[PDB]
């Protein structure tokens, strides 16, 4: 009789196979049956739980601690649990522990709970319906119990033969057959863990283990009972469990304790909050029979880093890449960053470990609560490929870096050993939003501040992506915190690089970073909008040397101006940091180009203002030159110069394709202001010539309103000043706030204006404004000007009937009431709310204004570094004369990488010294010292 029980509605769809057996059966047949016929996976652990069956008395805090610890030890490992097939005792509570942790839980949570029972008691006692497999071993009549014992010992012997699998024994609250199975498993060299202080037979063993420890023999130095307490343990074994025939179980409970490495005692009141899995791990590392990798992946499954450093990673047992590779895969995939660090620092290298298939697998088993799984799955949806590879990962990284980034998985043939294994496992750890794993993989790999700036860009752009998308879980606060963490890591590396040899810091911030799509550390810092990095002293003296191009870093603007239009007075009073060489080095400076742009642009604004304010006549073919004044021709020349300047800025973008040049060109809004003002000027000067009244009227109005947009373009000039620049950043963010609040202002303005114009001017009547346009513009207009305190009191109360209108007489008293309500709601309440929003914006910018000026100083340097090295009024002639990021040696790049890595090492060491020097870590280490003093005093006493 062999088959599969379907328990009648006792919890669980999955049925449980059973097998009638005998004790004559060798256990190799049983293990090949339960590994081939029943298809159980070979476990990393076999727990054998043993205790009482009928007379089972259990404590509630002990039963909850035991079942929580045993489920935590079995599910995190994937362990077999071997008990009896009995619906009562410790078997019932192990079965209920397995039952209550799987119903409405994860799908791949199935603990194979094997019940080895006797066929002579099933329907003695009923089989437990929460067990998974059943071994029903018998040889004779009913009531027999000893046929379970030997077969249960031999099956676990054969599990250790396939030692291979670390079988452990838990003993708690048992009786005579509990210590019988316990002794037969000790004979099979199964390490036992006894729960002392729990019950009637697991206390006695505890009361015979540490209370009566003694070594008084040769022959591997066994442990025996004390002669002082032999009377007490004999009274306890004859009274507590067992009435008659307790001599054989007393001899048995003595011969259990013969070997010190196979018995271990873990009580409840001794170590309360400590889980039973470390007790199992100490028993397995104490028996000294398991593989190093079996002990290793049990410590991985139980997150036991301290015992792994203590006894698994001893100096006498060395490690290799292939003997740590599966453990490293488990530590990476399950977010075990201290195990990952330990594996990297003992015997493992990412160059030998990480391959292409391991990395694609590493991006395959991302958990799902991260942003990177919806990003990769959306790229698979755009790709129509069922599997993951590095082309998908590289394209996710390209759209998640932005700014024409080119990921090296798309390019390099190794991604279709690896070139940079630390970098791409680091980028994996960053994309998975893993704090300590990305910290460990950042500390381990080269090019550290570029890696940290790229990580900050990835994390805050995933933060923007998860904030802007509803199909991605908003973990944006954790992502911005992680990005800020990598920002301060990059700043600290740059600070340690700047503390010695600032010249190497400047030559390190402008390098050829080939694994970052050939962009520098400054460009990785300004793409990531890392303001604390750009505000560092190294980046600012770099921007000041770039801003003063081969010219002394403190020459004032007036010397540049008087030597800018006088190239003969340039020789005495401009000093250089080392015919025409001094000329081209002076005009090459972006500060010279800046001062020339300021002066020529003030000249342009004055000429534009003379044209729009004083002389912009109509076009007529009667007089010469169409009547166009030659100041307007000089204005056409200089706006054509602005046009050719913006065409040169478009053509001089680092991409090669035209659409990518347009994408890089319209990244800043100043190019939007440029293209808008140029297009509106070209429309105005096309409409200039059509000699119609309305067309020329539109031409001059469009021109006289486009001077506003040229002056709006002139504010990047003001961004040169430390005071004025952040004020313009404030103006920009306040215009964003005003664009957000203008809908609420428009709703209350139009709501008041409709009622106001309805009560003043009722439309089917004699007080009606018989013009739809003056009605609509009154509804828009009069609340808006009344909002600024321009009360139309004499107008809206019926007086001034000429220029306002005949107000309805019943609307002459209701109009001040509506006006008063609108004034207290809009001038007082809404406008001061808008000013409060403006002040909140002011405080947010002013608390960071120094760093935001340092950041926009980069864009100021970039917009003048590319300008033509020519005259400030003749810069179109400079474009005519044109039309007609450093690279180091490979030895220099290697030395610069070594220097950057060593300064990162000093930074990481200083962070460890700050971490170990805090009050909490000092108190923690002092408590560990007090625990060592207590252990030493226990060894003395």
Ligand X SMILES: Nc1ncnc2c1ncn2[C@@H]1O[C@H](COP(=O)(O)OP(=O)(O)OC[C@H]2O[C@@H](O)[C@H](O)[C@@H]2O)[C@@H](O)[C@H]1OP(=O)(O)O
Ligand Y SMILES: *[C@@H]1O[C@H](CO)[C@@H](O[C@@H]2O[C@H](CO)[C@@H](O)[C@H](O)[C@H]2NC(C)=O)[C@H](O)[C@H]1NC(C)=O
Residue ranges of the annotated binding site for Ca(2+) are 646, 649, 671, 674
Applying CB under 6 A, among 176, 197, 292, 873 the residue interacting with ligand X is: 176
The answer to whether residue 710 forms part of the interface with Ca ion (CB under 5 A) is no
Quickly list H helices, 767-826. Answer: 772-787, 793-796, 811-822
Whose structure tokens read 């060592």?
A: 932
96 or 502: CB nearest ligand X: 96
805 or 868: CB nearest ligand Y: 805
137 or 479: CB nearest ligand X: 137
Applying CB under 6 A, among 413, 765, 789, 917 the residue interacting with ligand Y is: 765
The answer to whether residue 627 forms part of the interface with ligand X (CB under 6 A) is no
The answer to whether residue 671 forms part of the interface with Ca ion (CB under 5 A) is yes
- Side by side, the strands of the sheet bearing 46-51 are 2-5, 16-21, 133-137, 113-117, 80-83, 46-51, 167-172, 192-194, 263-265
Please name the residues in contact with 547: beta carbons below 8 A apart, sequence gap of 6 or more: 589, 590, 591, 857, 860, 861, 864
In the complex, minimum distance from the CB of residue 766 to ligand Y, in angstroms, rounded to a whole number: 4
Quickly list H helices, 614-692. Answer: 630-651, 658-665, 669-687
Handedness of CA 675, 677, 682, 687 (dihedral sign): positive
Question: Which residues between 506 and 525 bind ligand X (CB under 6 A)?
Answer: none
Applying CB under 6 A, among 53, 265, 451, 463 the residue interacting with ligand X is: 53
Closest residue to ligand Y: CB criterion: 770
From the list ligand Y, ligand X, Ca ion, none, partner contacted by residue 770 (C-beta under 5 to 8 A by kind): ligand Y
The answer to whether residue 772 forms part of the interface with ligand Y (CB under 6 A) is no
Contact (Cβ atoms closer than 8 angstroms) between residue 54 and residue 88: yes
The answer to whether residue 178 forms part of the interface with ligand X (CB under 6 A) is yes
- Our CA dihedral for 294, 296, 299, 305, rounded to 10 degrees, sits at 170
What is the C-alpha separation between 357 and 354, in angstroms, rounded? Answer: 8
First and final CA of the chain: distance in angstroms? Answer: 60
- Strand-strand pairing, 133-137 and 113-117: parallel
Question: Alpha carbon 648 to chain centroid distance?
Answer: 39
In the complex, minimum distance from the CB of residue 54 to ligand X, in angstroms, rounded to a whole number: 3
Applying CB under 6 A, among 44, 177, 505, 530 the residue interacting with ligand X is: 177
Applying CB under 5 A, among 379, 389, 674, 900 the residue interacting with Ca ion is: 674
In the complex, minimum distance from the CB of residue 769 to ligand Y, in angstroms, rounded to a whole number: 6
What is the C-alpha separation between 535 and 541, in angstroms, rounded? Answer: 10
From the list ligand X, ligand Y, Ca ion, none, partner contacted by residue 176 (C-beta under 5 to 8 A by kind): ligand X
Binding-site residues sit at: 646, 649, 671, 674
Closest residue to ligand X: CB criterion: 175
The answer to whether residue 341 forms part of the interface with Ca ion (CB under 5 A) is no
263 strand-pairing partners: 192
Contact (Cβ atoms closer than 8 angstroms) between residue 555 and residue 571: no
The answer to whether residue 55 forms part of the interface with ligand X (CB under 6 A) is yes
117 strand-pairing partners: 136
In the complex, minimum distance from the CB of residue 29 to ligand X, in angstroms, rounded to a whole number: 21
Stretch that binds Ca ion, among 658-666, 670-678, 825-833, 844-852 (CB under 5 A): 670-678
Applying CB under 6 A, among 138, 148, 277, 645 the residue interacting with ligand X is: 148
What is the C-alpha separation between 486 and 424, in angstroms, rounded? Answer: 16
Applying CB under 6 A, among 104, 566, 580, 766 the residue interacting with ligand Y is: 766
Q: At what angle do helices 390-401 and 448-468 cross, to 10 degrees?
A: 80
Q: For the chain, give the longest Cα–Cα distance.
A: 137
768 or 893: CB nearest ligand Y: 768
Stretch that binds ligand X, among 85-93, 438-446, 600-608, 615-623 (CB under 6 A): 85-93
In the complex, minimum distance from the CB of residue 596 to ligand Y, in angstroms, rounded to a whole number: 60
In the complex, minimum distance from the CB of residue 51 to ligand X, in angstroms, rounded to a whole number: 4
Applying CB under 6 A, among 307, 768, 774, 888 the residue interacting with ligand Y is: 768
Applying CB under 6 A, among 39, 220, 624, 770 the residue interacting with ligand Y is: 770
Stretch that binds ligand X, among 50-58, 68-76, 286-294, 432-440 (CB under 6 A): 50-58
In the complex, minimum distance from the CB of residue 134 to ligand X, in angstroms, rounded to a whole number: 13
SS3 content of the chain, % helix, strand, coil (to 5): 60, 5, 35
φ, ψ dihedrals at 737, nearest 5°: -65, -40
Applying CB under 6 A, among 19, 30, 81, 86 the residue interacting with ligand X is: 86
Identify the H or E element spanning 117. Answer: strand 113-117
Contact (Cβ atoms closer than 8 angstroms) between residue 16 and residue 2: no
57 or 566: CB nearest ligand X: 57
Stretch that binds Ca ion, among 364-372, 496-504, 554-562, 671-679 (CB under 5 A): 671-679
In the complex, minimum distance from the CB of residue 194 to ligand X, in angstroms, rounded to a whole number: 13
In the complex, minimum distance from the CB of residue 284 to ligand X, in angstroms, rounded to a whole number: 21
The answer to whether residue 198 forms part of the interface with ligand X (CB under 6 A) is no
754 or 768: CB nearest ligand Y: 768
Applying CB under 6 A, among 69, 84, 445, 726 the residue interacting with ligand X is: 84
18 strand-pairing partners: 3, 134
Q: At what angle do helices 60-75 and 276-287 cross, to 10 degrees?
A: 60
Nearest alpha carbon to residue 103 among 18, 10, 191, 237: 10
In the complex, minimum distance from the CB of residue 862 to Ca ion, in angstroms, rounded to a whole number: 10
What is the C-alpha separation between 199 and 176, in angstroms, rounded? Answer: 12
In the complex, minimum distance from the CB of residue 674 to Ca ion, in angstroms, rounded to a whole number: 4
The answer to whether residue 145 forms part of the interface with ligand X (CB under 6 A) is yes
φ, ψ dihedrals at 136, nearest 5°: -115, 90
Stretch that binds ligand Y, among 371-379, 664-672, 737-745, 762-770 (CB under 6 A): 762-770
Contact (Cβ atoms closer than 8 angstroms) between residue 616 and residue 585: no
- Strand-strand pairing, 80-83 and 46-51: parallel
Applying CB under 6 A, among 43, 45, 51, 445 the residue interacting with ligand X is: 51
Q: Which two tokens stand for residue 618?
A: 């109509």
Contact (Cβ atoms closer than 8 angstroms) between residue 196 and residue 212: no
In the complex, minimum distance from the CB of residue 183 to ligand X, in angstroms, rounded to a whole number: 11
137 strand-pairing partners: 21
Q: Which two tokens stand for residue 669?
A: 């809004």
- Strand-strand pairing, 192-194 and 167-172: parallel
The answer to whether residue 783 forms part of the interface with ligand X (CB under 6 A) is no
Summarize as ranges the residues that interact with ligand X (CB under 6 A): 50-56, 84, 86, 89-90, 121, 124-125, 145, 148, 174-178, 181
Summarize as ranges the residues that interact with ligand Y (CB under 6 A): 765-766, 768, 770
Summarize as ranges the residues that interact with Ca ion (CB under 5 A): 671, 674
């Amino acid at each position: 009789a062999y088959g599969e029980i379907d328990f009648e509605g006792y919890g669980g769809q999955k049925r449980a196979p059973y097998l009638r057996m005998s004790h004559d059966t060798d256990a190799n047949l049983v293990i090949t049956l339960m590994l081939k016929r029943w298809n159980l996976e070979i476990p990393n652990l076999v727990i054998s739980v043993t205790g009482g069956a009928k007379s089972f008395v259990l404590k509630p805090r002990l039963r909850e601690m035991f079942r929580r610890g045993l489920i935590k030890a079995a599910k995190t490992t994937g362990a077999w649990i071997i008990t009896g097939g009995t619906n009562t005792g410790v078997m019932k509570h192990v079965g209920e522990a397995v039952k209550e942790q799987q119903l409405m839980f994860g799908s791949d949570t199935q603990v194979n709970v094997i019940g080895i029972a006797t066929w002579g008691i099933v329907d003695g006692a009923m089989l437990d319906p929460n067990h998974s497999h059943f071994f029903l071993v018998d040889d004779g009549t009913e009531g027999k119990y000893g046929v379970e014992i030997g077969m249960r010992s031999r099956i676990e012997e054969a599990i250790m033969k396939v030692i291979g699998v670390p079988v452990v024994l838990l003993v708690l609250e048992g009786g005579p057959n509990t210590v019988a199975t316990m002794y037969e498993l000790i004979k099979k060299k199964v390490p036992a863990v006894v729960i002392d202080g729990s019950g009637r037979a697991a206390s006695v063993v505890g009361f015979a283990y540490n209370h009566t420890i003694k070594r008084n023999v040769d022959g591997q130095t066994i442990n025996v009972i004390d002669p002082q307490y032999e009377d007490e343990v004999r009274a306890k074994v004859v009274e507590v469990f067992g009435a008659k025939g307790a001599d054989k179980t007393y001899s048995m409970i003595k011969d259990v304790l013969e070997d010190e490495k196979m018995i271990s005692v873990y009580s409840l009141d001794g170590e309360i909050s400590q889980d039973i899995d470390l007790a199992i791990l100490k028993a397995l590392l104490k028996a000294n029979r398991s593989s190093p990798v079996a002990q290793l992946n049990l410590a991985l499954a139980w997150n036991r880093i301290d015992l792994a450093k203590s006894d698994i990673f001893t100096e006498e047992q060395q490690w290799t890449t292939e003997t740590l590779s599966a453990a490293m895969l488990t530590a990476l995939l399950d977010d075990k960053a201290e195990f990952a660090e330990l594996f990297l620092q003992n015997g493992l290298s990412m160059r030998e470990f990480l391959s292409l298939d391991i990395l694609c697998k590493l991006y395959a088993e991302v958990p799902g609560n991260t942003t990177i799984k919806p990003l990769l799955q959306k790229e698979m949806g755009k790709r129509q490929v069922k599997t993951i590879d590095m082309d998908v990962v590289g394209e996710v990284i390209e759209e998640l870096m932005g700014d024409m980034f080119e990921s090296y998985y798309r390019k390099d043939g190794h991604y279709f050993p690896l070139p940079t294994p630390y970098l791409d496992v680091f980028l994996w750890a960053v994309l998975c939003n893993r704090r300590e794993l990305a910290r460990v993989l950042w500390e381990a790999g080269r090019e550290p501040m570029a890696a940290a700036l790229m990580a900050s860009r990835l994390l805050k752009r995933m933060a923007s992506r998860a904030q802007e998308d509803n199909t991605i879980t908003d973990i944006s606060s954790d992502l911005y915190d992680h990005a800020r963490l990598f920002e301060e890591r990059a700043v600290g590396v740059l600070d340690e690089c700047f503390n010695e040899n600032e010249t190497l810091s400047q030559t390190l911030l402008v390098r050829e970073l080939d694994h970052y799509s050939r962009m520098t550390a400054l460009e990785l810092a300004v793409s990531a909008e890392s303001q604390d990095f750009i505000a560092h002293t190294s980046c600012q003296v770099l921007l000041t040397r770039l801003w003063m191009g081969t010219m002394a870093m403190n020459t004032r603007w007036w010397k540049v101006l008087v030597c800018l239009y006088l190239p003969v007075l340039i020789f005495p009073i401009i000093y250089f940091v080392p015919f025409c060489d001094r000329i081209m080095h002076f005009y090459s400076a972006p500060f010279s180009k800046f001062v020339g742009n300021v002066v020529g642009y003030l000249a342009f604004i004055f000429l534009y203002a003379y044209v729009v304010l004083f002389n912009f006549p109509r076009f007529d073919p009667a007089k010469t030159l169409g009547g166009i004044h030659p100041t307007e021709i000089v204005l056409y020349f200089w706006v054509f110069t602005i046009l050719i300047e913006e065409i040169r800025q478009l053509a001089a973008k680092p991409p090669k394709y035209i659409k990518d040049k347009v994408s890089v060109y319209f990244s800043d809004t100043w190019n939007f202001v440029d293209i808008f003002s140029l297009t509106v000027f070209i429309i105005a000067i096309i409409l200039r010539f059509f000699t119609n009244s309305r067309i020329f009227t539109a031409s001059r109005i469009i021109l006289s309103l486009d001077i506003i947009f040229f002056i709006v373009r002139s504010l990047q000039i003001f961004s040169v000043n430390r005071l004025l620049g952040p004020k313009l950043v404030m103006i920009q963010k306040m215009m964003q706030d005003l664009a957000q609040f203008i809908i609420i202002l428009a709703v209350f303005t139009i709501a008041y204006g409709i009622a106001l114009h309805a009560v003043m001017f009722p439309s089917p009547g004699i007080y009606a404004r018989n013009n739809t346009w003056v009605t609509i513009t009154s509804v828009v207009q009069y609340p808006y000007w009344q909002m600024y305190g321009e009360l139309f009191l004499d107008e809206i109360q019926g007086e001034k009937p000429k220029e306002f209108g005949e107000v309805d007489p019943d609307g002459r008293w209701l109009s001040p009431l509506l006006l008063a309500i609108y004034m207290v709601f809009t001038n007082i309440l809404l406008l001061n709310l808008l000013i409060a929003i403006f002040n909140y914006t002011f405080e947010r910018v002013q608390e960071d204004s120094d760093k935001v000026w340092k950041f926009q100083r980069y864009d100021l340097v970039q917009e003048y570094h590319s300008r033509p090295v020519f005259a400030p009024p003749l810069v179109l002639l400079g474009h005519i004369l044109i039309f007609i990021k450093i690279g180091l040696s490979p030895a220099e790049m290697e030395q610069m990488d070594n220097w950057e890595f060593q300064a990162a090492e000093m930074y990481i060491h200083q962070q460890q010294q700050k971490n170990s020097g805090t009050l909490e870590e000092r108190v923690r280490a002092l408590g560990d010292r007090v625990d060592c003093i207590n252990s030493q005093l226990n060894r003395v006493l």
